[PDB]
Scaffold this active site. Structure first.
Site, PDB file in Angstrom:
ATOM      1  N   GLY A  79      18.868   6.961  84.410  1.00 24.56           N
ATOM      2  CA  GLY A  79      18.378   5.678  84.921  1.00 24.56           C
ATOM      3  C   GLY A  79      19.270   4.501  84.566  1.00 24.56           C
ATOM      4  O   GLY A  79      20.488   4.632  84.543  1.00 24.56           O
ATOM      5  N   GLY A  88      22.935   5.483  83.085  1.00 25.05           N
ATOM      6  CA  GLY A  88      23.309   6.873  82.946  1.00 25.05           C
ATOM      7  C   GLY A  88      22.826   7.691  84.121  1.00 25.05           C
ATOM      8  O   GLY A  88      22.605   7.177  85.231  1.00 25.05           O
ATOM      9  N   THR A  89      22.687   8.984  83.862  1.00 34.88           N
ATOM     10  CA  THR A  89      22.072   9.892  84.808  1.00 34.88           C
ATOM     11  C   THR A  89      20.549   9.746  84.698  1.00 34.88           C
ATOM     12  O   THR A  89      19.850   9.983  85.674  1.00 34.88           O
ATOM     13  CB  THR A  89      22.508  11.346  84.547  1.00 34.88           C
ATOM     14  N   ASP A 138      22.018  15.767  71.766  1.00 33.10           N
ATOM     15  CA  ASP A 138      22.835  15.022  72.689  1.00 33.10           C
ATOM     16  C   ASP A 138      23.530  13.876  71.950  1.00 33.10           C
ATOM     17  O   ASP A 138      23.588  12.784  72.434  1.00 33.10           O
ATOM     18  CB  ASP A 138      21.938  14.504  73.814  1.00 33.10           C
ATOM     19  N   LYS A 197      14.907   0.456  79.142  1.00 27.58           N
ATOM     20  CA  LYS A 197      15.444   1.652  79.735  1.00 27.58           C
ATOM     21  C   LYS A 197      14.493   1.971  80.877  1.00 27.58           C
ATOM     22  O   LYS A 197      13.300   2.212  80.637  1.00 27.58           O
ATOM     23  CB  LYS A 197      15.472   2.768  78.683  1.00 27.58           C
ATOM     24  N   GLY A 214      23.700  -1.142  81.223  1.00 25.43           N
ATOM     25  CA  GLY A 214      24.408   0.088  81.565  1.00 25.43           C
ATOM     26  C   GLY A 214      23.483   1.037  82.298  1.00 25.43           C
ATOM     27  O   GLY A 214      22.302   0.737  82.470  1.00 25.43           O
TER      28      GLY A 214
HETATM   29  O1  LIG Z   1      18.050   5.514  74.633  1.00 26.20           O
HETATM   30  C1  LIG Z   1      19.048   5.075  75.211  1.00 26.20           C
HETATM   31  N1  LIG Z   1      19.909   5.777  75.943  1.00 26.20           N
HETATM   32  C2  LIG Z   1      20.852   4.919  76.344  1.00 26.20           C
HETATM   33  N2  LIG Z   1      21.904   5.278  77.119  1.00 26.20           N
HETATM   34  C3  LIG Z   1      22.859   4.463  77.633  1.00 26.20           C
HETATM   35  C4  LIG Z   1      22.682   3.086  77.809  1.00 26.20           C
HETATM   36  C5  LIG Z   1      23.679   2.282  78.356  1.00 26.20           C
HETATM   37  C6  LIG Z   1      24.876   2.862  78.763  1.00 26.20           C
HETATM   38  C7  LIG Z   1      25.070   4.230  78.601  1.00 26.20           C
HETATM   39  C8  LIG Z   1      24.068   5.027  78.048  1.00 26.20           C
HETATM   40  N3  LIG Z   1      20.575   3.698  75.887  1.00 26.20           N
HETATM   41  C9  LIG Z   1      19.463   3.747  75.157  1.00 26.20           C
HETATM   42  C10 LIG Z   1      18.737   2.813  74.422  1.00 26.20           C
HETATM   43  C11 LIG Z   1      19.162   1.509  74.134  1.00 26.20           C
HETATM   44  C12 LIG Z   1      18.448   0.802  73.185  1.00 26.20           C
HETATM   45  C13 LIG Z   1      18.782  -0.484  72.809  1.00 26.20           C
HETATM   46  C14 LIG Z   1      19.854  -1.091  73.428  1.00 26.20           C
HETATM   47  C15 LIG Z   1      20.560  -0.427  74.408  1.00 26.20           C
HETATM   48  C16 LIG Z   1      20.228   0.877  74.775  1.00 26.20           C
HETATM   49  O2  LIG Z   1      21.548  -1.259  74.837  1.00 26.20           O
HETATM   50  C17 LIG Z   1      21.658  -2.281  73.890  1.00 26.20           C
HETATM   51  O3  LIG Z   1      20.369  -2.340  73.329  1.00 26.20           O
END
Ligand SMILES: O=C1N=C(Nc2ccccc2)N=C1Cc1ccc2c(c1)OCO2
Length: 351
Positions: free
Chosen positions: A35, A32-33, A150, A53, A30
């Protein structure tokens, strides 16, 4: 050797690329804003799965990620056992100006699961267990002088998001039910310690409390407001405050929860929102018409009248108290009767 980034600052990278010479990109998780998140194989630690990330090559975001790495490391030092359900950082580095944080790989976030379920809501037992966990994780942060700021469904991840599909006879539709409701809390890029500078405006607008809008100052109760909004959204499958403007948001709050207490009105410097102790707003605007068509009192959103439902709504309402000094604390929420219905396994995090 050579590496590319787009005008928005993201790292250009496809499946099969390596970072440092240990992480191999094998899927997209995925973006976001901040990265992107990508699933990687850790060729330095057993060819094992990490979520990586990758932060935008932009000052603001690099800075927020340095802050996040300091929070994550402080959390893992305060919780060596992983008992308080925060994502586990396994490594961090700087890759050509992109801060990268490696995390233990989790499943889908709670928003994405919901979206793939066509926004059909989580069943109450699931909502209850998820609430208990959020309360536990955040109570821990709170007692270590931290506020997340957040919280939102996208920042809450299932450890494993495998599901089964049932057919619902009332709804005449299939329905996905996650097999394990164990979750983790992510994204500490905005997490603020008690002694640090507090920005005037925090939180994603939908999960943002009135003390932030009214510039009354904020602290840990901000996260409790966010949690209440999140529980609502898990339980109905749609956002409680689907808003994009401050005045509209306050009107929804009043329409859903009742009048903003007059003492918060006296204290705010944002008097443009009020006149003679009452909220001022344009009922004929598209925003006005939207809120009058769609925002109703909290209790009317209840789906069933049994005790466990009544208690969720009692908890939610105590979390959505306007006055942050009177809003329930998470220590207190963990004692709320709603949580009597957890199984012993759920209550002891053996799930
Ligand atoms: O700190 C974060 N902020 C995130 N935001 C995010 C990540 C994917 C889509 C929308 C928002 N994701 C993480 C960490 C994260 C940590 C472990 C993971 C993960 C994502 O995806 C599945 O395994």
């Amino acid at each position: 050797r050579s590496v590319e980034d787009d005008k928005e600052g993201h790292l250009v990278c496809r499946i099969g690329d390596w970072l440092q010479e240990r992480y191999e990109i094998v899927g997209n998780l995925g973006e976001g804003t901040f990265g992107k998140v990508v699933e990687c194989l850790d060729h330095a630690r057993g060819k094992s799965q990490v979520a990586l990330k990758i932060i935008r090559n932009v000052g603001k975001y690099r800075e927020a990620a340095r802050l996040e790495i300091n929070v994550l490391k402080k959390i893992k030092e305060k919780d060596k056992e992983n008992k308080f359900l925060c994502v586990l950082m396994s490594d961090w580095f700087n890759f050509h100006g992109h801060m990268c944080i490696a995390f233990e790989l989790l499943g889908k976030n709670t928003f994405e699961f919901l979206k793939e379920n066509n926004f059909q809501p989580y069943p109450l037992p699931h909502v209850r267990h998820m609430a208990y966990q959020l309360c536990h994780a955040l109570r821990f942060l709170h007692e270590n002088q931290l506020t997340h700021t957040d919280l939102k469904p996208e920042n809450i991840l299932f450890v494993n998001s495998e599901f089964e599909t049932l057919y619902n006879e009332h709804k005449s539709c299939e329905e996905k039910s996650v097999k394990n409701t164990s979750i983790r809390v992510a994204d500490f890029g905005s997490a603020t310690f008690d002694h640090e500078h507090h920005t005037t405006i925090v939180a994603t607008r939908h999960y943002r409390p009135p003390e932030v809008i009214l510039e009354l100052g904020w602290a840990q109760p901000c996260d409790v407001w966010s949690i209440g909004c999140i529980l609502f959204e898990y339980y109905r499958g749609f956002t409680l405050f689907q808003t994009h403007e401050n005045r509209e948001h306050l009107v929804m709050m009043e329409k859903i929860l009742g009048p903003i207490p007059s003492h918060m009105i006296h204290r705010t410097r944002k008097q443009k929102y009020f006149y003679k102790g009452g909220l001022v707003w344009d009922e004929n605007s598209s925003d006005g018409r939207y809120v009058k068509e769609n925002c109703k009192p909290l209790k009317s959103y209840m789906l069933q009248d049994s005790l466990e439902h009544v208690q969720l709504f009692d908890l939610m309402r105590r979390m959505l108290e306007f006055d942050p000094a009177q809003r329930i604390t998470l220590a207190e929420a963990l004692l709320h009767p709603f949580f009597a219905g957890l199984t012993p396994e759920e209550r002891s995090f053996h799930t």
